[PDB]
Design a binder for this molecule. Sequence first.
Ligand SMILES: O=C(O)[C@@H]1CCCN1C(=O)COP(=O)(O)OP(=O)(O)O
Length: 330
Amino acid sequence: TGSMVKSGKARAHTNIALIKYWGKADETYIIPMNNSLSVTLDRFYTETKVTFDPDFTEDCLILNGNEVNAKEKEKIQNYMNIVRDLAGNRLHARIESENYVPTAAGLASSASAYAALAAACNEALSLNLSDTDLSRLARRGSGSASRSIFGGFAEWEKGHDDLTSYAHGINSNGWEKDLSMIFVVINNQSKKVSSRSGMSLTRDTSRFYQYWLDHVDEDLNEAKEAVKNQDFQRLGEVIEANGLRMHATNLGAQPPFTYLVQESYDAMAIVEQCRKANLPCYFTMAAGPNVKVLVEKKNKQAVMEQFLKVFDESKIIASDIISSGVEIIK
Ligand SMILES: O=C(O)[C@@H]1CCCN1C(=O)COP(=O)(O)OP(=O)(O)O
C-alpha cells in the first residue's frame, strides 16, 4: 500500500436471532425496544476491505466487484461520516466488500456487512476500539450487526442510548460447537420488502405489540437459563414460541401483514414431525418466509433428510455455529 494509505480488512459472520429484535425505541441511533439473542453462523459471512487515502475525495463502495447506485452510495457516505468523527479525521475510503451470504435465497447480509466494515475501519485507522465499542459502531449501521462482532451465542443489550445499546458474547461452555442450523429456502415473491420498515409499522400501530413486550424478557431469561444448562429442548421451545409471537405482532399491525407463506407452514410441520419422531429441533423465521431449523449437530443430517423428502436439495442448506468473533484478514 501507499505511504500515507491506511487499510484494513475484516471477515464477519452472519448471525440468526433466536430471541427476536423487532421494533426500535430510537430510529436514528437504532436503539431496540427489547434485548435479542442470536447465534453466529460458521457458513455465511462478509469480507470487507477499506482503504483510506488523503487524495480520495468521496467514499466509494464496490460490492462483489460491482459499483453500487447513488442511493447505496449516499448511505455508505453517511455511515462513514460516523467513522470519520469517531477517528477525528476527514479521510474518505474505498470500500471493497464481498458477501459470502445466500442473499438471492433471502438470507440477510446486513449483520455481517456492518460488523465487517466496523472491524475493518477499526483496523485501518488503529482506533483500538473495545468489542463493546465495535458493537456500538456496527449497531449504527444495522441493529443485528451489533451481535455479529461475536461468535457463538451473543446478546444485544437494549440500553437507553448510543452509549449503552450494544452486544456481548455469551460463554456457553462450548455448547455452540454442538449446535447447527438448517436453512429452508422458501419460494417467495421477488418484490421489494423491508425489515426496518415492517417492524416500524408494527411497533407503531400493532394491536398485539404490548403482548410481545410483556413476554420478551421472560422469554429471554428462560433462553439464557436454558443455555447455561445446555438444555436444548428448553432453549428450543422458548425460542420457537418467541419467534412465533414476533410474527403474531405483524398480524395486529394497521393494516396487517405477514412474512410467512404456506410453504413456511409446511416446513414448520416437518419440524414438529421430526420432534414426534425423536429428532429434536425448532424453527424460527426473520423478515421473510425462509424457515431456519435449530438442531443438534448430531441430528443435523437426519433432520435434513426429512426435509429432503419434500424440498429441492438446493433449498436445504446447513451451517454450523462458529465459536470465534470478527476476524482481521488479508
Ligand atoms: O435480526 C434480528 O434480530 C431481527 C429479528 C427477526 C429478524 N430481524 C431483522 O430483520 C432485523 O433486521 P435489521 O437489518 O437489523 O434491521 P435494522 O436495525 O433496521 O437494520
